[PDB]
Amino acid sequence: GSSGSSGLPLCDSLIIWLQTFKTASPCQDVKQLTNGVTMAQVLHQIDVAWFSESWLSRIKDDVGDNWRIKASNLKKVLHGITSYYHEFLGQQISEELIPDLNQITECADPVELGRLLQLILGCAVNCEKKQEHIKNIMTLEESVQHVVMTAIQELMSKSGPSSG
């Protein structure tokens, strides 16, 4: 491989964060994450309570030569987070954060792919072990820490109450 950036910041940075997870599937370019396995594997690391082997066991990697298998996964990955915002936290997710899987599996756009990563980073900053991750950010590159840190703030601003 080689060193170099590509795509918007929200994604050009989020990736550097997901890199900390050397899961069965690495995280280099957006075209490598589009699969969904990488992300899913990361979710299990954040909290097994909501992401246990039982769930991650539904994700496949064969996507390599299959594009249909990708979506199937990307779906679970997202659904696994969203619910974690309405169930665990209780809040919801704005269409602004809602990752367009269809646009990530068919188009694989960097602007969309970055969104999916945001959801994962947001849940990792609102949990018990969250701290264990927060440190992984301060270790990243200054410029990176910024974007990675911004996402969190955007996750609290976009969030919306239910009643009361």
Q: Are 158 and 96 in contact (CB under 8 A)?
A: yes
Place of tokens 């209780």: 90
CB within 8 Å of 34: residues ≥ 6 apart? 70, 74, 104, 105, 108, 113
- Is CATH 2.40.420.20 correct for 7-159? no
Q: Distance (Å, rounded) from C-alpha 78 to C-alpha 86?
A: 13
**Distances 34 to 10, 115, 149 between C-alpha atoms, Å:** 15, 12, 23
Q: Distance (Å, rounded) from C-alpha 39 to C-alpha 26?
A: 10
